[PDB]
Structure formats: structure tokens, C-alpha cells
Amino acid sequence: VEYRGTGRRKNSVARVRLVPGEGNITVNNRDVREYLPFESLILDLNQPFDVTETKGNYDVLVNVHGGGFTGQAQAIRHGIARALLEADPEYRGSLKRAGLLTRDPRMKERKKPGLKAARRSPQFSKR
Amino acid sequence: MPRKGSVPKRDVLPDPIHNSKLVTKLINKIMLDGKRGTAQRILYSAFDLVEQRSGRDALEVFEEAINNIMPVLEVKARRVGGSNYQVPVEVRPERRTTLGLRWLVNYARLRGEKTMEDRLANEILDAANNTGGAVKKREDTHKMAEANKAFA
Amino acid sequence: GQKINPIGLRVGIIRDWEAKWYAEKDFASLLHEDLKIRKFIDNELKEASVSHVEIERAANRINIAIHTGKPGMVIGKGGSEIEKLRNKLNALTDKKVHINVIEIKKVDLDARLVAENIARQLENRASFRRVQKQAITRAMKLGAKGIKTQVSGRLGGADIARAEQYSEGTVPLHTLRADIDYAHAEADTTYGKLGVKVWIYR
Amino acid sequence: IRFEIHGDNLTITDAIRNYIEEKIGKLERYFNDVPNAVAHVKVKTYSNSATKIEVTIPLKNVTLRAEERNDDLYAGIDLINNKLERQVRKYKTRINRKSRDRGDQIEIIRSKEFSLKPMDSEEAVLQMNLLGHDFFVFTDRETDGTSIVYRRKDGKYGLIQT
Amino acid sequence: IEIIRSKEFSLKPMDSEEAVLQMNLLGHDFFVFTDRETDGTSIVYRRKDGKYGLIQT
Amino acid sequence: ISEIEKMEEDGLFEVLPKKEVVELKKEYDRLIKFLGGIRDMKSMPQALFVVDPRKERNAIAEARKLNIPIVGIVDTNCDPDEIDYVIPANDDAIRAVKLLTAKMADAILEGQQ
RNA sequence: CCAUCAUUAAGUUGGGCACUCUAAGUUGACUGCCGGUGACAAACCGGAGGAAGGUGGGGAUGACGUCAAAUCAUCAUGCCC
């Protein structure tokens, strides 16, 4: 059993799979606490399968790609959310109402020319 | 759009340790220059000294300390010209939450010790014991807005 | 305001290229051979009702397509001047093979012709407002939809320059569907240079 | 109250550099009682007609522009300082109207009048529908009495005679 | 055909407050009376608003 | 209106955007709102029949400039000077209209044959 | 680009795994769809429907015109030298 979902946020793609077992993540073939830096946002990263209560059910073992640590995280909780709707397909409203299953809504904004960087206009003296 | 109407205020994510929204909002205000981890580690080492110098867990102590910080009257200036132009106005509940967090951090940065390991926790136990520096400017607002009470 | 030229929006969006070759290595020098023979074709033809040219290059057989609102004048008398052009065009570059020419109907609805033939109605110095109105009234008479044209500097012979435009018809300069064609000529009147723009549509 | 002076094709002297600050400078120093600003003086010669003088003094809210197209660069500033002194008084009396004496501190039944008129009951139904009104009061054409056609809670019509 | 049932009433002088009282004591949405002080025929009615309206005829 | 209803009974209707379908139909009803009775009329009239010169004073002012003869229902608060062919009748009642505007509508039918 | 095969120095090699990913040619979001009491007058307000929701985010595009605004040193040319 391999329920393989994908997930994107902030220029960082994250594809997951779901092998049965218990809750244990193997992001880039290594431990999460030695890969994700400070362990705070991991309990916010466990929010999507919290509402389906499949804690001791699924090992995931993500292969992540690109971005940063808050771009790799917040993309595997969106990663397994596309995979949780092929594990519990009737539980789509439990994830739609609370968070995870929305999107990659927003990335960095374009630097316009004639300007310092990304909508921050430069200082002028004489008003 | 602050003249089409009001801006839609957005949701935050509560802390994992204390399971509190109020802790994460304290993380974001002590987050100087976008550094999330290097400021969150300091708060996670600025309530252990709280729980060392008092037996109670700090999630009780935090919401007990900020109640000696959060004022109930403030001053909004109305352009009346030659009048006092300082109307004592009560505080909305959203600004009631925020402005206590502001005074708690802005006077934690002006103590004798250098580490915010114990710059923060000293002012919390002062605010837990209704004393210190962030408490005494609430009384300064309660000696300013409560002195010009002719504009209720 | 600062209206940019209407072709520049649409090059590739709703139009195509006046040069359609490719060269990865040595892109620079054989790009100069284009505007060598964009100056040179504009030298000896000297308003032979030429609207614009196209250049395509492939395997040292480099093509040149000219439109020539008066066709046959570049050809000559049964392939005379078209062969008299390749006697110099094949010397300024190496090959210049397969020089040819196609024809266009509606000789003065292409905007390169419309700007040019009334700019040459200014060296004789006669009634610039009618020189405007000759172009507008004839435009949708011949089958156009929207017409717009102006003359900018030393207007009428005076000192202070004044723009003077005349318009009717749908000229959607901001709509990206529109096949707007403009042109700019350099009509001298021996008291400066008059500038004249046009805008045709369909 | 500096003077970034610069002349288009005119060499600036030093006799101008004392005549400016006495008139452009000092007569606006006692205006704007908290001053920190920079002036700008252009002198643009035109060989065909004359010179011109442009003096721009920006401030907190409203700037101060004036122009003279004279050729005398000493008599023209006698008119620039005249236009400058007028514009400051416009600015100050705009903001010196602070002195304004401002001292701080049942069921209504709307009547709709109608004039009673004689008609058929069918006519009263027609006119009542043309307004969507649930009540129409008229004098009956044949009976002569005051009649009220109304729409019941039934949705059917009822007729009252008063 | 449509039959409109007539309810005959005899017009009487009273206060507007009295007309409200009597109209409520029947639950009627319309009460027509002659105004005590103005002398004119008045119709107190309940609007689609639920509020009262007063018409003078 | 002789063209826009022809425009959607044939093709050139599937390729259009679904909101341009709306304004081509939002134009379509608003034509037959005002010009619905002038659907098949292509020339000037030779007589005009008005129910009220007060509320329809814009029509009567155009009638007297074209020298078109005019007939109309007038009453109190109506000027009979601009009407050449005067019908004094009531105007704020339906049967006063309908049992009087029908015979004038009937007046042309036995003028045909 | 390597879940399932391993001889992983990782050759990401053998097969091709082509599946996901990525890289490019196209289907789709508009007040289409409901409810308000809100009366029809469009909107607004609150839902659901999709990943996306109210010109989605951003770019390009700058009306008539104002300033004898700025370049005769990118060029081009009237006049003067």
C-alpha cells in the first residue's frame, strides 16, 4: 500500500507516499529532528492527519526538493493532504474546513525596476 | 483598504509547547529582523527561569503578568485645535491584547543583564508581582488619561 | 502623454517579424548586414512605393522580400531592374540569392505608404490640413476602419511648433487584438523637419 | 535658508549674492517661525527676448513659486519678493483659523396624504395594483359612499364601506 | 368572478392612540376613524415594515 | 432589432463569451422595452393618438413641428390648444380609457375596407 | 526525474522504471451558480461548489492634456558660426 501524493508551497515541490505502519517521517532518507532545524513547526506540520486521527497508522518517508526549511515544511503537510484524500476520501471536508488542503497560495513578489527591491520605493529628500 | 471599510484580520497559529496563541504572538514581537529560531529559543529559555523562581507553570504566570501591563484607558488625540485635544478613550480588545505585549518587550530590552535569557524573565516576574518598569508606565498612562478626565 | 509606438506591443503577439532568421554564434556581425541592406534598399529605390522589407537567411541563400506598392518598378521591364538590383546586392554581401518581390493591393492603406505620400505633399508646401483630410477621407473609402494622423513641428511655416491631429473610426491602441500599423516620415520643408505620424486599422 | 543659485548661460556675480539674502532671505525669515528650508534661484538668459528669474521655496505643506520675465536682475527681484510675501500670507491665514469658538457638549407614523376620488371598484383594483398597495380608498361611483378595497391575509380582495 | 366581502364600519372620532388600541383589539392591519383634533378621516395601518403608518384622506 | 434577433437564431452564438451573451441579450430586451411597438414601423406616421398631453408632452411638441395631426384624450389639467382633435374624457380610470380608446382603435378597421 | 531489481564508489549506472517530479504544447473563474429581506435597481452581505472568489497576485499597456519640462553630446536638421 503506497498512497502517493504531492504538495507544493513557496517554490518547493514535495512528493510523499503512504506506507502503513506508524507515524514516522524520513525526509530525504534521514531523521526529521536532524533535518528540520528547531522542532517547533513539526507539530504544526502534523495538523493535516490530526483531523483524521491517523497518528499510529502511516509512515510517509518524503522526498522533498527545493526551497527552504519553512518551504520544505508547510509543503509536506500539504504533501500528505493530497495523499490523505486517497486514504480517507470521505474526510475531505475535515481538511477543507481546517487548513492544509488549500494550495500554494503565494510566493515572492517581482522586483520592479526603478525601485530598491520588491515594491519598496527608495528614499528621496525633498518632499 | 482603510477607507473602503475595515481590513480583514487574519488568523495565527498557536504554540506547540504551551498550546497558546498568546505565546506565538510574543514570539513574533521578540523576533528581531525575521530570525524565528534564534528568538523562539530565547523565549523557550525565558520561561524556565520563570518556572524556576516560581513553582507554577509559566502559561498561568504569563497571562497573570500581562494583566498588570494591559491598561484600560488610553489617549486618542482629536483635532479640536485650541482645546486639550487629548480624549481619554477605552481600549478595544484586540489593541488590549497587543499593547500589553508591546510594553512587556520594549522595557525588557533596557535592563542591566545583557542576555534576554534573563532580560525577559525578570520583567515577567516583576509584572507577575505588579512591579517593575513595564507595570509603572501603565500607571503613568493611568495618571495621564485619568488626570484629563474632562473628555469622557 | 507618452504614447509608445503601437507596433512594439504586438511584435509576435498579434504580428510577425520583419526579419525571421537565426544565428547562435556570430549573432552580432551578420545582424549588421541586415541594416546594411535596409539602408541600401532605401537608398536607390527612393520611395518606389516601398512599405517594408523582410530578411530570411538559410544556408548562404539569404532571401529578401519587398512589398512595393508600385509593383514592376523594382522589377523593371520584364525582370530588368530586379536583376539590376542583384548586380550590387550580391556584392555588398556574399550570396544574396533568390531576391524576389511580391505585390500588395490597396496601395495606400499600408501605413508606410500613407505617411510617405503625404509627407511628399509638403515639399510643394500646399494646404497641410487638406493634406491631412486627403488621407482621412480616402481611407475608409478604400476599405479601412479607423484612421488617425498628425503633423508636429514648424506647422504651417510659423515659429512655435503645434501638433495637429484628425481622427475618426475605431482605433483601439490599447487592445492587443488590433492590427494597428503606424509610420513616421521625415518631411523637410527647408525651415526644419516636419514629422508626420499615421495610424491605420483594417 | 540656503540659496542654491545657478544661472543658465549667465555668470553669477557676488553683488547678487548679497542682494538676494536681504530681500528673498530676510523678509521670509520672520515668517515661518520654526525654519529649516532651502531656496532655489534660476536665472535663464534668452538672447532673443530677455532673462527670467524663478524662485522656489518648499516648506512643510505649501511651496512658494514666483516668476518674473524682466531683464533687470535687480528690479525683477523687487517683484519676486512681492509675489513671495503675498503667498506666505495666503499660507498662514489658511492655518491661522485655529481660533474657532467650538464648545464641546416615541413611535413616528409617516402620513401619506391622498385625495378621495370617485371610481368603479374595478378602477380601484387597477390603480391599487399600479402602486402595489394592499389598501386603496375611493368613493364608490354608483353608491356615493367611501369604500376601501384591500388585500386580505387570504390574498383575496375585501371591500369595506365606511 | 371575484367576490369581495364587504365589512361595514361606522366612522367615529378618536385619538390616534385610541385607534391603535381598538385596531390591536381586533388584530386588523387597518383602522379608519375621524381624527379627534384634526376632524379629518384618518387610516392607521400596519406597514409591511411592521411599523404603523397614518393616512389622511 | 431586425438584426440582433437574427444574430442568435442562426450561428455566431457558441463562440461568444457567456457574459457577452448577457449584454447582447441585455441590449435585446431593452430595445423591445421602449421600441417594442415600433418593431415593424419604418417610416413617419400620419396621425398620433395620445392618452394624456400632460405626461406625454414630449410627443406632442414633436407633433406640431412636423405638422402631423393630433387627437387625444384630455381633461382638467390638460391644454386643448396643442390638440387639434379634442376628446374630453376622464384619464385616471381604466374603463374611461379602455371603453374610449377601443372605438378609436376600431375607427380605422372599417376605414380599411 | 529512480517507489519496485541491485554490483550505490552514489556511474543515479543495467533495464528503462515514465509512475510521481520537472521541463513544454492546452482545459478552466464570472458575481456562472444560491440564500438574504433587499426590493427587484444594480450592487453589496453570508454561504458553497473547484486548487483558486469577487478587476485572484503581479507585469505590460499611461485618454484629452499641463510644465516654451529634459536632450541641437545617441541620432537627425532650420539658422548662425
Side-chain angles (χ1 to χ4, degrees), chain A residues 1 3 5-38 40-43 45 48-58 60-87 89 93-96 98-99 102 104-115 117-119 121-125, chain B residues 2-75 77 81-82 86-91 93-113 115-152, chain C residues 1-12 15-17 19 21-23 26-45 47-48 50-60 62-72 74-80 85 91-94 98-102 104 106-180 182-187 189-202, chain D, chain E, chain F:
Chain A
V1 176
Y3 291 157
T6 62
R8 298 181 183 92
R9 187 180 185 273
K10 199 175 175 66
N11 198 359
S12 67
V13 67
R15 65 267 186 98
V16 303
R17 68 183 67 251
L18 293 176
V19 60
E22 63 94 21
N24 194 0
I25 319 296
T26 315
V27 285
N28 285 322
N29 297 114
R30 62 183 291 165
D31 195 2
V32 183
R33 276 82 64 193
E34 297 294 327
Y35 186 74
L36 275 73
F38 56 89
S40 176
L41 46 89
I42 301 173
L43 292 178
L45 193 68
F49 63 94
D50 196 2
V51 299
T52 60
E53 286 89 10
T54 61
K55 272 81 72 175
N57 196 3
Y58 286 155
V60 179
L61 60 94
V62 189
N63 192 1
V64 79
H65 185 273
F69 57 91
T70 61
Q72 290 171 354
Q74 292 182 356
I76 73 104
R77 66 182 292 274
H78 186 274
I80 66 102
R82 291 184 184 270
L84 191 59
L85 269 69
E86 65 184 0
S94 65
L95 279 77
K96 184 187 288 183
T102 57
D104 44 352
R106 54 190 175 94
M107 64 292 298
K108 293 183 73 69
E109 194 268 331
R110 181 257 173 88
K111 177 183 181 295
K112 274 84 70 176
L115 191 145
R119 83 177 64 248
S121 67
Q123 182 180 1
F124 65 97
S125 67
Chain B
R3 291 198 294 179
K4 275 82 173 180
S6 179
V7 57
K9 195 262 182 182
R10 67 189 185 183
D11 195 2
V12 298
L13 195 279
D15 190 73
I17 300 298
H18 292 284
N19 198 0
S20 178
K21 294 182 183 293
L22 198 279
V23 175
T24 309
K25 191 177 187 295
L26 198 152
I27 296 169
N28 290 319
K29 202 264 185 294
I30 67 173
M31 184 177 70
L32 193 148
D33 199 74
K35 292 182 181 180
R36 179 67 62 85
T38 318
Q40 189 179 6
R41 185 186 297 113
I42 287 173
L43 178 59
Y44 285 164
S45 296
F47 77 99
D48 56 355
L49 184 63
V50 173
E51 292 178 352
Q52 191 267 329
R53 291 182 291 118
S54 178
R56 295 176 292 172
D57 287 331
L59 78 160
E60 183 181 2
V61 183
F62 281 167
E63 62 184 1
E64 193 269 330
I66 62 172
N67 291 318
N68 291 317
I69 306 297
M70 293 157 72
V72 301
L73 289 177
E74 60 93 22
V75 174
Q86 286 180 355
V87 177
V89 179
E90 68 271 16
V91 185
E94 289 84 3
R95 186 173 174 85
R96 181 68 179 271
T97 303
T98 297
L99 191 273
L101 270 299
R102 296 172 61 86
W103 287 350
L104 189 145
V105 179
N106 288 317
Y107 281 167
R109 297 177 183 175
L110 294 174
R111 296 182 66 88
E113 63 273 13
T115 64
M116 200 173 285
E117 185 75 25
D118 56 353
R119 281 178 183 269
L120 187 64
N122 287 318
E123 191 69 29
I124 293 167
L125 267 297
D126 289 331
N129 292 318
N130 200 359
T131 184
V135 172
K136 71 181 292 295
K137 82 172 294 185
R138 181 180 64 85
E139 185 66 29
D140 288 331
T141 59
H142 290 296
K143 288 181 182 179
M144 186 67 202
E146 279 76 350
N148 195 359
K149 290 295 291 183
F151 297 97
Chain C
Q2 293 295 322
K3 286 85 174 178
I4 76 169
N5 52 1
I7 297 297
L9 274 304
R10 298 172 178 89
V11 181
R15 289 177 61 86
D16 285 328
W17 289 96
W21 53 267
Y22 178 74
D26 196 4
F27 183 77
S29 179
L30 64 93
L31 187 274
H32 300 297
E33 295 177 354
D34 289 332
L35 70 155
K36 286 293 289 183
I37 63 171
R38 264 72 176 267
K39 293 187 289 185
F40 186 73
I41 285 175
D42 288 332
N43 282 318
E44 63 261 8
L45 286 177
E47 61 167 2
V50 172
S51 68
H52 55 91
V53 299
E54 288 86 2
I55 307 298
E56 191 271 325
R57 300 189 180 183
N60 288 317
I62 61 100
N63 294 114
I64 299 96
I66 315 100
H67 285 279
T68 68
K70 292 180 182 179
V74 69
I75 300 170
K77 301 285 103 176
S80 297
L85 183 63
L92 194 147
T93 183
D94 287 332
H98 296 286
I99 176 65
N100 55 3
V101 57
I102 62 100
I104 51 96
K106 265 64 186 299
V107 62
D108 51 358
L109 287 182
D110 287 330
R112 295 291 298 163
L113 264 296
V114 180
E116 186 68 29
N117 58 3
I118 67 101
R120 298 282 84 81
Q121 291 179 356
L122 295 172
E123 283 83 2
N124 56 3
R125 193 178 64 248
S127 181
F128 60 92
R129 290 182 66 190
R130 193 265 303 161
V131 170
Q132 293 286 317
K133 189 62 65 68
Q134 187 65 255
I136 284 101
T137 306
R138 184 261 302 154
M140 72 290 293
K141 179 70 175 177
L142 196 63
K145 190 182 289 183
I147 189 66
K148 180 177 174 66
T149 177
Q150 69 179 359
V151 168
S152 179
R154 299 299 297 270
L155 188 271
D159 292 332
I160 297 170
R162 288 184 291 112
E164 182 70 28
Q165 62 182 356
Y166 294 96
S167 300
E168 75 267 19
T170 300
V171 187
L173 293 173
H174 292 173
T175 300
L176 273 299
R177 279 88 174 273
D179 194 2
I180 307 296
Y182 92 109
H184 184 269
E186 197 180 1
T189 56
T190 325
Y191 51 85
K193 296 190 292 293
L194 272 69
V196 49
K197 295 184 178 68
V198 293
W199 287 273
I200 60 99
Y201 179 62
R202 308 306 303 272
Chain D
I1 191 65
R2 297 177 184 177
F3 291 96
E4 295 184 357
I5 53 96
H6 48 278
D8 193 1
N9 293 319
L10 186 143
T11 62
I12 190 69
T13 65
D14 289 331
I16 301 166
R17 295 296 303 275
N18 200 2
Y19 185 75
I20 292 295
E21 287 80 0
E22 183 67 28
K23 290 183 180 180
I24 304 299
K26 289 181 181 179
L27 274 77
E28 283 80 3
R29 292 297 297 164
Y30 58 88
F31 295 105
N32 302 117
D33 55 356
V34 281
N36 42 1
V38 174
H40 296 282
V41 175
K42 286 185 178 180
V43 177
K44 294 190 286 184
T45 61
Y46 298 101
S47 66
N48 288 318
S49 67
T51 63
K52 69 184 290 183
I53 297 168
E54 296 180 354
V55 172
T56 66
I57 298 170
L59 292 175
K60 292 181 181 179
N61 291 319
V62 176
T63 65
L64 297 172
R65 291 179 63 92
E67 291 182 354
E68 286 293 327
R69 292 182 183 272
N70 290 318
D71 201 3
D72 290 332
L73 47 85
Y74 287 160
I77 300 171
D78 293 332
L79 278 76
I80 291 295
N81 198 6
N82 195 2
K83 289 183 180 180
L84 261 293
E85 202 273 333
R86 181 178 173 87
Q87 291 180 0
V88 180
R89 297 174 69 186
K90 181 184 286 184
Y91 173 71
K92 294 183 73 68
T93 62
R94 184 182 297 275
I95 53 95
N96 287 319
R97 57 186 179 179
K98 296 179 182 179
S99 295
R100 297 292 180 91
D101 196 1
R102 192 263 181 275
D104 289 331
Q105 63 185 357
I106 61 169
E107 295 181 356
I108 295 172
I109 296 173
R110 203 187 187 177
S111 185
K112 181 182 275 294
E113 185 178 357
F114 180 75
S115 170
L116 205 50
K117 298 187 192 266
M119 61 189 78
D120 205 66
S121 63
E122 304 291 9
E123 184 77 6
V125 176
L126 205 228
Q127 289 183 46
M128 192 204 301
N129 289 335
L130 291 174
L131 308 173
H133 273 188
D134 307 315
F135 292 104
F136 196 99
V137 47
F138 66 112
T139 152
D140 197 83
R141 180 178 69 197
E142 298 309 302
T143 290
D144 302 300
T146 297
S147 288
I148 297 111
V149 188
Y150 65 93
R151 178 177 286 103
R152 305 171 69 71
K153 300 179 179 179
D154 235 288
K156 299 181 181 178
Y157 294 93
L159 191 59
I160 282 159
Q161 185 175 2
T162 52
Chain E
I1 61 169
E2 295 181 356
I3 295 172
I4 296 173
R5 203 187 187 177
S6 185
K7 181 182 275 294
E8 185 178 357
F9 180 75
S10 170
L11 205 50
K12 298 187 192 266
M14 61 189 78
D15 205 66
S16 63
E17 304 291 9
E18 184 77 6
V20 176
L21 205 228
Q22 289 183 46
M23 192 204 301
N24 289 335
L25 291 174
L26 308 173
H28 273 188
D29 307 315
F30 292 104
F31 196 99
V32 47
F33 66 112
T34 152
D35 197 83
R36 180 178 69 197
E37 298 309 302
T38 290
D39 302 300
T41 297
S42 288
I43 297 111
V44 188
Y45 65 93
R46 178 177 286 103
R47 305 171 69 71
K48 300 179 179 179
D49 235 288
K51 299 181 181 178
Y52 294 93
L54 191 59
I55 282 159
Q56 185 175 2
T57 52
Chain F
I1 197 63
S2 67
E3 191 268 331
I4 192 168
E5 67 181 3
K6 186 260 289 181
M7 187 269 177
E8 65 183 1
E9 287 182 353
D10 63 356
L12 294 173
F13 185 75
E14 193 271 332
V15 74
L16 296 175
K18 272 78 69 177
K19 67 184 291 184
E20 189 172 357
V21 174
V22 176
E23 290 104 15
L24 265 293
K25 190 174 182 179
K26 191 67 178 292
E27 184 177 358
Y28 175 73
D29 58 353
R30 193 262 303 277
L31 263 66
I32 53 94
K33 283 182 183 292
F34 300 101
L35 295 175
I38 316 298
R39 178 68 183 87
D40 293 332
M41 188 176 180
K42 302 295 185 291
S43 66
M44 73 291 290
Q46 295 181 358
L48 199 150
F49 183 75
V50 68
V51 68
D52 193 4
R54 184 178 64 246
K55 289 178 71 174
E56 201 69 24
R57 65 185 183 272
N58 291 319
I60 311 299
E62 298 184 356
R64 294 182 67 187
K65 289 183 70 174
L66 297 171
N67 291 318
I68 295 171
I70 182 62
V71 57
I73 302 99
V74 302
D75 54 353
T76 314
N77 285 318
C78 292
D79 192 1
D81 195 2
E82 61 267 15
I83 290 96
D84 196 1
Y85 290 144
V86 174
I87 302 171
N90 197 3
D91 207 3
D92 57 355
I94 297 98
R95 290 174 69 89
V97 173
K98 185 174 174 65
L99 293 175
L100 194 275
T101 194
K103 184 174 173 66
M104 292 298 107
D106 189 74
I108 58 98
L109 292 175
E110 62 267 9
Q112 293 179 356
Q113 68 271 14

